[PDB]
Structures are given as C-alpha cells and as structure tokens.
Amino acid sequence: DRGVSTFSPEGRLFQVEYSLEAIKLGSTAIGIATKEGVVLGVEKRATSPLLESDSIEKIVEIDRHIGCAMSGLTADARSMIEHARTAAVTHNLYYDEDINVESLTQSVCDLALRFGEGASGEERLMSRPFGVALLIAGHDADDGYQLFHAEPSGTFYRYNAKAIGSGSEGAQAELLNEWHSSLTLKEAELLVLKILKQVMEEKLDENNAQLSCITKQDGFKIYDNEKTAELIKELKEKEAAE
Amino acid sequence: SDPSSINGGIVVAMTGKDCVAIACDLRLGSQSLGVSNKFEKIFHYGHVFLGITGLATDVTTLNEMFRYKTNLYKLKEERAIEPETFTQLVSSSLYERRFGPYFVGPVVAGINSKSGKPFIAGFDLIGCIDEAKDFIVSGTASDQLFGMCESLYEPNLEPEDLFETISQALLNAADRDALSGWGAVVYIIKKDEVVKRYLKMRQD
Amino acid sequence: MTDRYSFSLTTFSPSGKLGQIDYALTAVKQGVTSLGIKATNGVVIATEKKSSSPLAMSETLSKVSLLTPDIGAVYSGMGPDYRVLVDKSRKVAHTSYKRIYGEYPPTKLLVSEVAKIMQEATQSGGVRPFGVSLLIAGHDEFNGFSLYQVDPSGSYFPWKATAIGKGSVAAKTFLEKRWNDELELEDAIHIALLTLKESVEGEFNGDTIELAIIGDENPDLLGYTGIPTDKGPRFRKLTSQEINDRLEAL
Amino acid sequence: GSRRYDSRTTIFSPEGRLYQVEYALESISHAGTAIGIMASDGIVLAAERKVTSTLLEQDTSTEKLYKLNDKIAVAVAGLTADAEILINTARIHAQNYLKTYNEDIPVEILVRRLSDIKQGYTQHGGLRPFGVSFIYAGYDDRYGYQLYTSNPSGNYTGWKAISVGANTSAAQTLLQMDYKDDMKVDDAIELALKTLSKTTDSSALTYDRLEFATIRKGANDGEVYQKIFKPQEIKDILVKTGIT
Amino acid sequence: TTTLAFRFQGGIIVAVDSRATAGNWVASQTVKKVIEINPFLLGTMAGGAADCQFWETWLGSQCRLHELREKERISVAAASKILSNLVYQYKGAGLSMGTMICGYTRKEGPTIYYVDSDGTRLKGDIFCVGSGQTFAYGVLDSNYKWDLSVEDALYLGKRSILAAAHRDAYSGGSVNLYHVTEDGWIYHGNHDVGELFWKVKEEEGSFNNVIG
Amino acid sequence: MDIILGIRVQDSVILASSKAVTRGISVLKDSDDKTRQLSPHTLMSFAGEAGDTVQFAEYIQANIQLYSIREDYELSPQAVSSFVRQELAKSIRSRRPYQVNVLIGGYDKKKNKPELYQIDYLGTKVELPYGAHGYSGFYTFSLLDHHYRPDMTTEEGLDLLKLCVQELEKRMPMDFKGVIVKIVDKDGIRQVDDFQAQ
Amino acid sequence: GYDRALSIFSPDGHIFQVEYALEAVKRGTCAVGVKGKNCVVLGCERRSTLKLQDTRITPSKVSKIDSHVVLSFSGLNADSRILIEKARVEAQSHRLTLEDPVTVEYLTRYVAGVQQRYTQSGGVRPFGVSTLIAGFDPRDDEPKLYQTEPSGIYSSWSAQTIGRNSKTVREFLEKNYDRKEPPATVEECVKLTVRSLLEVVQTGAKNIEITVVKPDSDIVALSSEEINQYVTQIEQEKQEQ
Amino acid sequence: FRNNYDGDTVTFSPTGRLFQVEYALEAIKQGSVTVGLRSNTHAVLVALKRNADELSSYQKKIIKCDEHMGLSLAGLAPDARVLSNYLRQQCNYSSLVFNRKLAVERAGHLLCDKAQKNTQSYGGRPYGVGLLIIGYDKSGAHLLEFQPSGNVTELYGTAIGARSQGAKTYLERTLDTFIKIDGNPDELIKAGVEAISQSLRDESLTVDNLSIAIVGKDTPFTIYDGEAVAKYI
Numbered sequence A: 001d002r003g004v005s006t007f008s009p010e011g012r013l014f015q016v017e018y019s020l021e022a023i024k025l026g027s028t029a030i031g032i033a034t035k036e037g038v039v040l041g042v043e044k045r046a047t048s049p050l051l052e053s054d055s056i057e058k059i060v061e062i063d064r065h066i067g068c069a070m071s072g073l074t075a076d077a078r079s080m081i082e083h084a085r086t087a088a089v090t091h092n093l094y095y096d097e098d099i100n101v102e103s104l105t106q107s108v109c110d111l112a113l114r115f116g117e118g119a120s121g122e123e124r125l126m127s128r129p130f131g132v133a134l135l136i137a138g139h140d141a142d143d144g145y146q147l148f149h150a151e152p153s154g155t156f157y158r159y160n161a162k163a164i165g166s167g168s169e170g171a172q173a174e175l176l177n178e179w180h181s182s183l184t185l186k187e188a189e190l191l192v193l194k195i196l197k198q199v200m201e202e203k204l205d206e207n208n209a210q211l212s213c214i215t216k217q218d219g220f221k222i223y224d225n226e227k228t229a230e231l232i233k234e235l236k237e238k239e240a241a242e
Numbered sequence B: 001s002d003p004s005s006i007n008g009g010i011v012v013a014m015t016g017k018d019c020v021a022i023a024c025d026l027r028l029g030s031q032s033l034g035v036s037n038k039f040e041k042i043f044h045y046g047h048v049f050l051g052i053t054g055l056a057t058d059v060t061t062l063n064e065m066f067r068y069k070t071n072l073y074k075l076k077e078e079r080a081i082e083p084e085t086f087t088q089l090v091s092s093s094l095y096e097r098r099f100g101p102y103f104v105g106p107v108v109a110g111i112n113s114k115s116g117k118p119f120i121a122g123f124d125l126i127g128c129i130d131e132a133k134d135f136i137v138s139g140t141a142s143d144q145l146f147g148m149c150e151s152l153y154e155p156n157l158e159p160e161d162l163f164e165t166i167s168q169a170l171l172n173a174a175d176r177d178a179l180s181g182w183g184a185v186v187y188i189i190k191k192d193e194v195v196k197r198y199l200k201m202r203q204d
Numbered sequence C: 001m002t003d004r005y006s007f008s009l010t011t012f013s014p015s016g017k018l019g020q021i022d023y024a025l026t027a028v029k030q031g032v033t034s035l036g037i038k039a040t041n042g043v044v045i046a047t048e049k050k051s052s053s054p055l056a057m058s059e060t061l062s063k064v065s066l067l068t069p070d071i072g073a074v075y076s077g078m079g080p081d082y083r084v085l086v087d088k089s090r091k092v093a094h095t096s097y098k099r100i101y102g103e104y105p106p107t108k109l110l111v112s113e114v115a116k117i118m119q120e121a122t123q124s125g126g127v128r129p130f131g132v133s134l135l136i137a138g139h140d141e142f143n144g145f146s147l148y149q150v151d152p153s154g155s156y157f158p159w160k161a162t163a164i165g166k167g168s169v170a171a172k173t174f175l176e177k178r179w180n181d182e183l184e185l186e187d188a189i190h191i192a193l194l195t196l197k198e199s200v201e202g203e204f205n206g207d208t209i210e211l212a213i214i215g216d217e218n219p220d221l222l223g224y225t226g227i228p229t230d231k232g233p234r235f236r237k238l239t240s241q242e243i244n245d246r247l248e249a250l
Numbered sequence D: 001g002s003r004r005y006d007s008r009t010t011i012f013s014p015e016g017r018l019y020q021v022e023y024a025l026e027s028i029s030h031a032g033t034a035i036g037i038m039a040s041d042g043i044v045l046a047a048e049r050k051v052t053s054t055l056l057e058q059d060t061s062t063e064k065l066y067k068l069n070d071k072i073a074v075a076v077a078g079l080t081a082d083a084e085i086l087i088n089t090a091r092i093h094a095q096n097y098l099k100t101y102n103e104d105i106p107v108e109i110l111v112r113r114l115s116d117i118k119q120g121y122t123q124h125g126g127l128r129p130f131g132v133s134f135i136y137a138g139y140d141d142r143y144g145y146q147l148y149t150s151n152p153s154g155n156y157t158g159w160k161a162i163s164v165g166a167n168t169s170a171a172q173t174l175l176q177m178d179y180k181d182d183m184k185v186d187d188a189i190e191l192a193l194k195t196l197s198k199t200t201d202s203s204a205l206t207y208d209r210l211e212f213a214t215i216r217k218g219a220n221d222g223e224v225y226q227k228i229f230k231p232q233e234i235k236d237i238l239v240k241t242g243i244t
Numbered sequence E: 001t002t003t004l005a006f007r008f009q010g011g012i013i014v015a016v017d018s019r020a021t022a023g024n025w026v027a028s029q030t031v032k033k034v035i036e037i038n039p040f041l042l043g044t045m046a047g048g049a050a051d052c053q054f055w056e057t058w059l060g061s062q063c064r065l066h067e068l069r070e071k072e073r074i075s076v077a078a079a080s081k082i083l084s085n086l087v088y089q090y091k092g093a094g095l096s097m098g099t100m101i102c103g104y105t106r107k108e109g110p111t112i113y114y115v116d117s118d119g120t121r122l123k124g125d126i127f128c129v130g131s132g133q134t135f136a137y138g139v140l141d142s143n144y145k146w147d148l149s150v151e152d153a154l155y156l157g158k159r160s161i162l163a164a165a166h167r168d169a170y171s172g173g174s175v176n177l178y179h180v181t182e183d184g185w186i187y188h189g190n191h192d193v194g195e196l197f198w199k200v201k202e203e204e205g206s207f208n209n210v211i212g
Numbered sequence F: 001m002d003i004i005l006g007i008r009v010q011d012s013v014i015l016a017s018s019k020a021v022t023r024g025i026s027v028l029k030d031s032d033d034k035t036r037q038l039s040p041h042t043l044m045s046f047a048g049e050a051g052d053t054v055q056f057a058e059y060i061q062a063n064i065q066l067y068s069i070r071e072d073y074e075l076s077p078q079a080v081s082s083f084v085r086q087e088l089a090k091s092i093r094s095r096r097p098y099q100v101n102v103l104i105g106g107y108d109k110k111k112n113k114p115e116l117y118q119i120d121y122l123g124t125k126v127e128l129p130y131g132a133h134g135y136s137g138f139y140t141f142s143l144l145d146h147h148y149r150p151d152m153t154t155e156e157g158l159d160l161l162k163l164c165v166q167e168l169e170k171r172m173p174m175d176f177k178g179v180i181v182k183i184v185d186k187d188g189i190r191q192v193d194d195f196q197a198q
Numbered sequence G: 001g002y003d004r005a006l007s008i009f010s011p012d013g014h015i016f017q018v019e020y021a022l023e024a025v026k027r028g029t030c031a032v033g034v035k036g037k038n039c040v041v042l043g044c045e046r047r048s049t050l051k052l053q054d055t056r057i058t059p060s061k062v063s064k065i066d067s068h069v070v071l072s073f074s075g076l077n078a079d080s081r082i083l084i085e086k087a088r089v090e091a092q093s094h095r096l097t098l099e100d101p102v103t104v105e106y107l108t109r110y111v112a113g114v115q116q117r118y119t120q121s122g123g124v125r126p127f128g129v130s131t132l133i134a135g136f137d138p139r140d141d142e143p144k145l146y147q148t149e150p151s152g153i154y155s156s157w158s159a160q161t162i163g164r165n166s167k168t169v170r171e172f173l174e175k176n177y178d179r180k181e182p183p184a185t186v187e188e189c190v191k192l193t194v195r196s197l198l199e200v201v202q203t204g205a206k207n208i209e210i211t212v213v214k215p216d217s218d219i220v221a222l223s224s225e226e227i228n229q230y231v232t233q234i235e236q237e238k239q240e241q
Numbered sequence H: 001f002r003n004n005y006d007g008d009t010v011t012f013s014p015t016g017r018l019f020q021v022e023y024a025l026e027a028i029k030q031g032s033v034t035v036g037l038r039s040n041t042h043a044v045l046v047a048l049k050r051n052a053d054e055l056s057s058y059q060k061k062i063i064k065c066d067e068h069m070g071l072s073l074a075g076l077a078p079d080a081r082v083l084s085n086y087l088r089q090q091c092n093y094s095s096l097v098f099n100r101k102l103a104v105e106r107a108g109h110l111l112c113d114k115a116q117k118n119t120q121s122y123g124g125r126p127y128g129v130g131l132l133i134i135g136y137d138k139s140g141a142h143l144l145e146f147q148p149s150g151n152v153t154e155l156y157g158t159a160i161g162a163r164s165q166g167a168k169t170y171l172e173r174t175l176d177t178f179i180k181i182d183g184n185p186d187e188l189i190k191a192g193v194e195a196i197s198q199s200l201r202d203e204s205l206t207v208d209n210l211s212i213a214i215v216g217k218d219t220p221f222t223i224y225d226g227e228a229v230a231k232y233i
C-alpha cells in the first residue's frame, strides 16, 4: 500500500489530510469567546428517536477552568480527554497552580503526530492519526478567556469564534460577520444557538443541541436542557421580532 | 530452621523376592505441635510409587508435578512410565532447581513391567540418585532407619516376610524420633497385586 | 535492519491450498529417489548419491544420517535444508528428551519433534517451508522397529515400505509387489537394492549408492566395555564394499 | 521494506468476512470426513482416513483421532501438522487445570481455550490461521456426555450429531434424517458408519480407511471409558453393522 | 504527634497537634497535619512528614481525576483504598505513615478510615494515631458518648490533643480542629497550646498537678 | 497472634475469629471480621502480616468470583482450597511472600458434606475435623481431641467452641476481644450474632 | 513484532476495516433490548442454517458480566468471547479497587474503549462485534441499556436492536415503544420484545431466547415454554382481527 | 516513473533522487516566508506570520532555544517544535556537562545528523520543515539554514518559504552593506524588514502580522511581536 506517514507530492501527510475529511462529516460544534466567558455549543444528532439523547456526550470538562467540544470520530477523543485531564491535574500537583489553557492545548496536540509503523524519532505507537477535532475553551490568569481549535495535524489556533463539523464553512462565514470584540456572554449564547439552527438539518430544540460555558467565577458548566430550552425560546422571539 | 525439619516424617523402601515395599509415617506437625495424623507421603503413577519426606508444601507440590508429567508422558509415549525412567525424571526435575531446591527426600519403588525386576531409589534434594538393591531411607529419622535396616534386612524376603521387616524398621525408628510417627502405612508391591496396610503404633 | 518479516509467508489461497507447501512438495518430487523398507528384524533406508561433479568426493557428503544410535534419516529434495534439519534433529533428541529422562527418544516421538520444526516453518513469520521429505527409520524397546515419512507440511505417517523423490510412483509400485510381513532384514536390503536400480540411470555400485540399516545391536561399535546394559548402536551404515558384495548376488 | 510482501492475513472483506478463515474452511472441506454422534449412554467418533495404501502401516497410524484427556478426545479435519500443535497445547491445558484444582478439566473449559487460541490468529499477529476443525467428544460430571465443534474462526458449538470435513452437507442431511434423542451408543455407532458409508468417495468403506472411538460408561464399574478401536476392532464392528 | 478523629451524632470531629521533631529537636510547632483532600475529604498525618504530606497530596489528585472521569465525588472508602493500595506497593521499602481518611458522602454517611504504611486499612468510629495516641485515647475514651453537641464534641477533641501535647514530648505547638457534616468539613481554628493550657487549667480546674 | 478456629461438625463448618486488632501498645478495633466469602458456600478466615492478610484474601475472592461468573457454577470447596494452596505455594518463593495463614470452610453442595481446610503461608494444606492457626492450637487441639464427635450437631459444635473460647480467655496472654462466629452449610453462610453470651 | 496499521483512513475519510467490521455485525443473528419501568429485557434469535445441535452446552447469546449486568451481541462469536472476558475481569477488578460493583455505564464505557483501541493500534483488526449491555447500577432501580459498536462509540437507548434485519425490528420498536409510558410490567415488557423479534425470526419459539434483568442482581433466562407461551398469546392477538 | 520510487525514503529513484525527502522539501516552499541575516555584532530573524480566519491568531514562527540561540520555521509547525526542542536539549546538555555554550556550528551538525536518520531507515519520515538558526557564540554572530534533507549551511543571510526568492535576491544584492551593520541592531532589523518585504504580494506587513527576533554581543536572543515591532513598519 503506502506508509501511514508518507508525504504527498504536495508536501502533505496523506493520513492527516484524510483524517481531516472524516472530521468534515462530524456533527457541528461552535465556540465563541467573549470578555465575559467562552461558550461551547454542539449538535447532538441522535440517529434514532429511541436513542436517549442526553447520553450523547460531546462537551466534556478537562478541569474546572477548561472544557472542550469535539467533532468527527468521537470515540477517538476519549484518550485525548484522559490525557488532557491527567495533564491538567498533574500540573497542579507539581506546581501548585492551574494549567494554562494554551499549554493544556499544546499538550493534547503533542499526542497528535504520535502515529506510525516505526517513525525514526522516538516510539510513536498508534497506527493512525485521530479522527476528531477539538475546541478547547477555558480561562487562566495569564491570558483570560481563550478558545482553541486543535486538529489531528498537531497544530492548533486561537479563535474569537470557531465552528467545526458538517456546517462549519457556512457557520464560520457567519461568525466572521457576527462576532465583535464587545459581545456579551448572553449575546454569544443566542449567536451560537442561532448558527446551530441554521446549519442543523434537525429542528434545533433542547434535545438535539447542547450549550455550555466557562467563566472565571463559576468555571466550566454544561447548561441543563431547561436552561437551554429557554434560551431557544428567547431566540425565536427575538428573531420573529424582525 | 532446617526446612526439612519443620513438618517431620519418614519413608523407607525395601526389595524382596519379586516384590518391593515402601512405607511411611502419617505425621505432619509444625515443630513440636502435632497437626495431622493423616498425612500420607506415598504416591503412585501407574505402577511406579513415590514416597516424599521433607517440607510438606513441597511434598504436595512435587506430587502434583509428577502427576502432571507422568500423565503427559503416557499420552505421548502411549505406555506408563517405568521405575528407572521415572527415577531419571525425578532427578532432572530436582536438579533443575539446583540453587533453590525443594526441601524433599524422594524415594522411588516399583517393578519394571517389562523385566519384572524390583526397583528402588533415593535422591538428595538436588537430584543425586542413589539406586540401592536392598533399601532406601528418608526423613527426620533416617539415622534410626539406617540402623534398623542394616540389621533387620536380608535378601529375597517373601512378601509376607518383607512386610514384617519393613514395618519393624519403620516402627522402631519412628519411636526414637520426636518428629515422626502418629501412624504408619505400608505398601507391599508384586507384579500382579498391591496391598496397603495401616500399622498400629504409639500415638505420642 | 531487524527482520520486519513477522507475518506469514505461507497463506491460504481462495481454493484452500497452501502454495508454499505445495511448491515445497514439488521441489521434493524433483529430488533424487530415496526409499525405506521395514523387515521383521530391521529397517533399511537408501538413496542414490548423485555426485554433482566427477571431482567431488561423494563420501564427504552423506544423505543417510544417524540421529540417535537407533535412528537414522534419509531424504529427497533440498540437500542443504536436510542438513540443518539433521543438526536440529540430533539436538532436539537431547535437549527435549535425553536430558530429561536419561534415555534416547523413541522413533515416533523424535519424528514428532522434527515434524513440529517443519510445521513451524509453515506458519512462523518471515520463512519458507523446508524443501524436503524425510524417511526416519529407528528402533525403541517398546515399539520395536519403525519407518516414518515427514513432509514439508509437518505431516508424518508410518510405513511398511515406501519411496519418495523422482521415481517414487514407480518405486512404490515395485515395493507393493515384493513386500510381505515375513521379510528378514537381508531380504529387505535386497528388495531395496533392486528397487533402487530402476531409479538409477548410469553407474550403480557401492560408491554411487548409500544405504544404512537399523538392526541388531553392535557392541563392536560401542567404543567401550564394562556396562552390561549398554550393548551397542542398532544403526549401521553399510560400506562401499558391503554394498558391492551384495550387488553380486543381485 | 517488508510491507510489500505482507498478505495481511487478519483483515475484513468489504462484506465483513475473514478471508483466511473462509479459505481455511475451504481447505478443510477437502479433508477426510469426521463424524461425532452423541447418545444417551456414550459418544461416538468416526473418521475416514484420507490417502491410504497397501504399504501404509495402520496399526501404528493415527491421523484423525487423538486422546486429549482420559475423558476427552478429538476428531481432526484438516492439516494434521496444524492440529498437533493445538492438540499438544490442549493436553497441557487439561493437566494444568488438574494441577491447580485437583479436578479433571470440564469439557467446555478445554474447548473454549483451544477456540480462543485459534480466534487469536484471527485478530492479530499477521500469521495464517490453523487449517483445522475439531469435533470434541468428552465427559464430565456437570454436563455428562458432550459433543463440540471448533474451526479456523475460533467459534465453537455443541451438537447431538455433527460432521466436519468433506461432504458435510450430505452427511449432515443423513444424520438429521435418522438421529433420535433416545439413541443408544451402539445405535449411534451404526448411524455413524452408515453415514460415512454413504458419503464416502471410495468404492467401499473398508476398515483400513477408518478410525473409530467411543466414550462409554462401562456399566460394570460406574466410571467412563475411552476406547480408540484398533484395526481389527474396526474390521469387526464393520461386519456386524452390516457393511462387512 | 497526636491525631484523632471520631464519629458522633453530629458528624465527625478531627483534631491534630502541629509539632515536628527531628529526633529530640523541635523542628517546627506550626505544621499542618491535616490535608484538605476536598470540601468533603480530610486526611491526617502521623509518622514521616514528607511521606504523609506527599502521598496525601497525590491522593487528592487521584480523587480529582476520579470525579472528572466518573462525574461524581469519590467515596471515602475508595479514597482510602487508593492510598491503602499505593502504600502497599511500597511495603517494606521504608514508608512511614499512620493515616486517617475522613469524609461524608450521602451513600456512606460519616466515615473514617485508618490507613498506615503497614498496609493496614480499618473503618471505625474512633481512632487516635501518633506517638501521643494513648494520651488522647485516655481523655477521649472516658468522655465519649454518641450524643455530644457539635460544640461539646469539638471541645472533647481539642481537649484530647491538649492532654497529649502535655504528656507527649513529641506532641505540642497548637491544635487544629475540624468538623465534618454532609455539607462538607468546617474548620474550627488553630489553638496554640501556649495559651490553651493555662486557659483550660484555670477554667476547668484540671492539670491541677502543674504548678500555676 | 489472632485467634483463627475452625470445626467441622455433621452438616456444617463453623469458623471463629478474634475481633481485636492491636497495633503495638493500643488495641485499635474490637469488631474486626477476619473473613471473606469466596462463594455462596465457601468462607475463608485469615491471620498474619498486617498488609498481606487482606490483600491476599480479596485477591483470592476476586478470582473465585470471576471463575463463578465465567462458568456460571460454584467450584467445590476442595477445588477452591487447591487453588488457594497453589497461590500460597507460589508466594513462598516470590520476592516478597504473603505472610498469611487461612482456614477454608465450605459446603460441597455436590457431595453434600461440610469441609474444613487448613493452609499456612508455606502452602501446607491439610483437611481436618477441626483446626487452628497460631497459638490457639496449643490449647484447643486437645480440648477438641477430647470432646469431639463426627456426628455432632451445629448446636453441639457451637457449644464446643464456647468451650474453646473460654479456655483461650483463661490462659491466652492477650485480650483478643472475643470472636465472631460463622456457619457454612447447605444453605450458605450466616453469622451467629449472639455468641458474646451463647 | 507485527504492527502493520490495519485500520487507516482512506481519501473520503473512512476507515474501511471498521466499516467492514460493522458489515460482520449486520450479518450476525438479531439481538434486541427494551427497558421497562422496572426491568430490562434482552432477546436474541438463533440461526437455523444447521439444526441438530445440543442446546444444553452450546454457549448462549446473553452473557453475565457480573451479577447485576449482562451483555448480548451481534457479529462474530469468537470475537465476542474476548470482549466478554475482558469485561468480566474489569468487573471484579473494579469491585476490588473501588469496593463497589461497576455501573452499567462504566462497564459499557470500558468495553467501548477496548473496541476503540482496536481501531487505532498496529497489528490488529477491529472487533466484528456490536453489543447491548444492560442491568441496574448498585443500589439503584432505574433500568440501564446501552449499545456499543466496532468504532468504539456507545450510548443509551430506551430500546434498541442490532444484527440482521435490525432495521425492521427497530421500526417496529419505534412505532410500538412509548417513552411516555414504558412497559410497566416484566410480562408486558417481555411481550413487546418477543413481538419485535417475531417480525424477523419467522416463527421460532426454539429460535428465540429471552433474559429478564431486575434490580439487585435478579437475572433469569426463560425456558422454551415460558417463551413459547408469549409466542402463542401474541399470534392470537393477530388472528383476533 | 516517480510513482514507483516515492512510497518511502528507503528507495532511490533510477536517477539517485529521494522523492519522499523532496516532497517534504516542498512543504517548506508552501510555508510562509521568513528571513535571516547577520552583521558581525548581531544576527536577525524576520518572519511573516500567517493566520487562518480573521477570527484566528497568527501562528508563531520564531522559537528560542537558549539565551544565545534561536530559530524561525517554514513548514510543518509540529516538526519545528520537535527539532527546536531537540536543539534546546543539546544546548542544555552542553551547559550542564561542560559549562559551555553550544556553538552554532555544532548545533547545525547535530540537527543535520538528527534529520539524516529519518531518510535512510524504513518507517521514518523526513521532517517537513525548514529552519533558519541565528546565534552568538565564541566566534561571533552566525546564521544557519537547515533543510529536511539534512543539509545545514552557514550564510550571511537567506530566506525560505513562498516567494522567498524575492528577499534572497535582495540580500544577495545588499550583502556588502548589511554585513557591516555592527553595533546598530535597529539598522540590521530594518535591513531585515526590507529584505522580507521583497517577498510580499498579498498584503503588507502589519503589527500582529510581523515577527522579529535578535541575538548579539551583549544581546540575549529575544523575540518581538505586535506593538513591539510597530517601530519597524
């Protein structure tokens, strides 16, 4: 066939590129950062009415000041989360302080390229790249509220807002215009909830979509249906208002 | 201290006319404390008998090991192992643990099914084979047993006579050893049949 | 470096065949004829010494090998494969038997060991099966005399008489006629020489033929005296001279 | 490097099938037929010797019936070499169980182990599977007489009557036709020989082409007995049953 | 060192001294012998400072991971076993720690586990650990009842450490108190023995021995 | 040491185990249950080194339970004890051996008979009418050697223990804080909650 | 030694070996699970390609991981064994370390991880298995039902089915199961399950096994009759129309 | 042709080429331009940072390896992290064991040999990143150009990345001038910004778009970003 770490004639790693494709098929996920906190939203996407929608976990906590959303082959993210949590807790044990959001991200990204059938650099044991992207969101005293996009490539970027998944290209286009440096947490919630509605095949309700945020005061929380549903409503009204 | 002196017990084998005998006491104590008077130290695989004195845990372990090995041996060879061969197997098995041996004093007795010749052998804890034509002694009362045998024994005894002789050697030796006794058992082995008897002895 | 060939080189084809084994067998067919005959008091194994150059000294090369003092082997197929097989066979008879029980292994069991070695080269990673078939002939106290055939697959079977290699089909037929359960060793040796003749093109003498037997014990071949139960090896390779003397009454 | 020559023996087909397991089975289908019939008072194993000859020694021969335990035995269909490798690990497994618990190994426990070993060569290792199918015939005090079957895949199942190797479809049909729950060992013995006799690719079902074994509870004792028939014993039973 | 923890009608009381000794030398009188694993979990220290302090901190980390993993607070029983099993891994290597793992969970209620480097793990209502244990037991055993006002129990605990600090040469400095309810643990101050002794003496009339 | 007693009567096995847990100068607990149920009809009592004691018991427990689930069957008492001996026998030659002694009391639902197994840290196994680990033996072995019958009832048996426990409270140097008794029989395992005055 | 990357990405972002693993599942006999208000039931069909087996000893389809949790599956049998073993082992381990049996969700998460792991490790192929795991968490009466697949993905269901013709029986269940009101009775819950299987088993009371799990390690498998009876009372329901 | 010899790095093409290395080499050309130049007193790095959206950040291009050494990357960001981390260890090792600052010439030899290992052994892949290393050691100021093929070269100045040929010509022209900008960092940096601008096209260099680093005589290697580089735009 061809090595799992072969370069294309264009200078790209085939497996990583293909990895990116599987992610495009993933369920939408959006992250918006405001000086009041960061909001993470995701499309549940139950493949059947019998599937208890709340057993769909695509937004998890890394630490009290760091949470993250995923898109793509979600089973692949379990070990990434484990590593991330372990890194976070560990930094605290060794330094008696919280892990910086960016470092936490950098750590996760370092596992990224650890694949191959025998790459001359260490002992990269993992037969293929991960098939999932992550939106890591949190806050730390050094750089306040932050939002990171981490990919199977090992690279990561910082965004004011970012959408990954099936409707990304379109939703990102919206975010490009919608986002402004003075957004409020409230505004960001509706904005996320709105864009999710536009890209979702399903009629966005409080069962096929989930919200969550991270604030210096209360840390990472995942909005419970009742809370999100009322935000849904609050949105319909404002829209139907003009 | 001496592992071979924790539990106590003795075994002794003898050759007679077209027969072999092997006996043992039934004691299993912990130092001075007598614990069991039902600890037989004689086992057999097919027509080959094996007595084992020493540390109880190893006595048990070795029996379970030789059963395992003799069973596979039969499945592959398609015949039961003979005394001579088994002696070799016992010897190599022990020497394999040369620098961390089992604390046992193995004794083999049996009749070569193909030659009908009586056979007995003793081994030190690392396999040194002692193949005697008259008798083999083992256990915490081995000195006494040597004394008994060297005097009482005489060639080609008939089964009924060999039984008296081996039983008297065992009995009187055990009575001079604080760690042996509490009942004995004796096996008289002939080509055709094998008889097992429990002796009546002091219980102190 | 490091052998990265940790996968099987012999696999199942859609038809259920194991190619490499089939091919190995083919290599055996192309090999020089060799045969075995079991009598009531001995076994004989022989083959033709196909010297590959008039300058080569055929004595310096034996196709008939002693494995234990009562077991010998002969083959058909790849000479070098056979050679290393013989070394392994002699060693396994020790490490896996004599060193445990203090006595040489009985024929069926040693054969069983050799067979395994071949089976493994059929499934292990990075290797090809052995390109040979063997004929083991030996004797043990509880099984008497025996003759075995071991194939590249690792399969083996007991024989009253058989042949492998080039003219096996023909040789086998000639043996099925002449064999009976009353043959004495000398008779088998004779049948042997006759059977081999057909399969031999040109020269046929004690220098182009190689034959050994498993028969009575040879105290004279022991090398020492003083131990009653040690009566001598049953395996004996006939000499060029012994072979010719027989060919005269052929 | 090596990748170029890697057959990749452990992968799924687009249909979700294991190529090698399938092909291994394909190989087994050409092996001498083996039949296992379980009765109320015993079990029966019968197998047809593939490839025979005037010169083939039969008293010394064994190629399909192997004793694993004192209460367990198997009938082989496929690569003998491969089978032996497994058979020996099986004999060891039984002895270990015995050493650990001082009790003879329960039949299914032995079968699951062997099946597991096979299953492994199916999921990892890059090696080929064993081209073997076993019919297990054994007895224990928890399920009495049992008859099992395992193949290259690593799956096993229980049976009242079963065949493996060549012409199984034919053989299975015939057994499905005359097998009855209340059968007796000798009944089973006959049904076995008859089935083979009907599926045989040979002219006649002679003894020199058979291997036979029975696990019967010799009434005059109270214990179970394993018996692999000798050439003559098969020759006899072959006459009585009416095949002469 | 003297540490005690006991269950009563109002939850759990935990009291410790604060003296560290290197032989007969008094290294410190201000050591925190209570590790706050979390809002509902406390650990006491006895034996080697480094050993306890280090491994109990490590325990906190292990508990936190459990909660992130399982989305739920770890049980007192489980927290104590993490420590118990870890410590058992090092059995014979020289670790020295007499520890108490105390907490309150809805499912277990008030719970106290004693864990030492021996590999010993025990659940109980009362436990006194350290060189001053016997002294604390003397006072505690003969004044303990299941019905003690959260305020009386608090004092009994404090008084028991006081007894130990007095008699034991290795115990002293100050007393650190804690109360554990299902709502979590509540810190009830640091009481220096320097002032506490005289106060208690005068007010209670005890220690009548000492010359005042 | 701790008191570990076992006596096999007619249709059951009774295990008595001291409740005290002492560390040096202080008795830390008086209600300690030195036992683990390996299977519904198999109970194991233990005594020995501080850590190894429970670590070993729970380890054995886990395995016997795993075997039960996998086979949907309960191994005979004999089999369970053989497994335990093998484990201790391995331990004795390991880097750091388990310093644990145990009594295994079980009811063989098949043979329909009670069984008592004594096994020390060396892997020494013996089956007895009654047994004990530690010093207890030195007192009880002759008490039972005297007042013991094969056909005794569970009730008679419990009285025989009462006899033993009394002698132990009279002559033993330590205060083992009484024992916890348990009965294993055709119906399983139960505790005699009223022995502190039975 | 052998570490070839057997599960890898293809141009369209697919991992064929994992997908082909699912195909193996689709070909497996049907399995279904429905949770009532106080119990969960698991049903499985028995192939008939060959019939002359010994049902006493032939390994059944519903396996106990612990006393309060069971697991059924669709796909390769040999594969399922390895997963069931690992699970049973983890079960005992969890009891030993946390001094508490596993929750159904935990056990499920474990198994799912093992499956996921085999999709990105060299030298191995994914499990040609998909599972249904159900039971009651220790000291909890809320029935639990989860499903896992080769990819390593899992989630809970009110009712679900896997294996051949699962598409069909799922339909039946989607228009026969009301979350609003779950089968309040063990009996009515076991009926719904048999009904759903009858859509695909095509009359086979001997080809349909059931297992009822109740709170507090109360697990029991019904007999042919007990089952055969539900088959009967159900076939009449039809005729009576 | 090529298609039969580019499946790995353990294969030579009929003409003696190593395609996998060449493809890796391509990843660099596709990367954002970066420049390096040095006088006798200082060495300077100037890099154009690239972003994804306008809602994203600009990926860092300069990494510090020690107080006297640092580099700029073009290509696979991860690989640059790997290699720069390796360079940090080597610098660190030289200090801890010998109490010696790792010479730039030596650092270069190390990188070369580390890279080479992933071009002759099956399983490994070449690194997909180019590096420009500057440092001040016992022989003064230095500038190195590192290629994934393992070829490391010492130059007065150079550039790598898309449209890099622009700046490289400029420097190759300015040479005699900037190599003498001793004792005046701000001038060398300006010469550096003028060099890099010769590779612009899309836009012009802004504040959160430009990145500059410098090391010299009494100047510990330091990076400038944002407003810090404003005074040069």
Ligand SMILES: */C1=C\C(=O)NCC/C=C/[C@H](NC(=O)[C@@H](NC(=O)N[C@H](C(=O)O)C(C)C)C(C)C)C(=O)N[C@H]1C(C)C
Pocket (backbone or CB within 6 Å): E001, E002, E019, E020, E021, E022, E027, E028, E031, E033, E045, E046, E047, E048, E049, E050, E052, E130, E131, E170
């Ligand atoms: C509780 C008192 C005790 O329970 N036991 C007396 C032993 C005291 C231990 C501890 N003090 C120390 O551990 C001192 N450090 C120390 O001894 N280090 C060792 C060394 O030899 O240097 C190392 C571990 C080999 C120091 C930290 C004061 C102490 O005061 N124990 C108290 C309480 C738990 C602090």
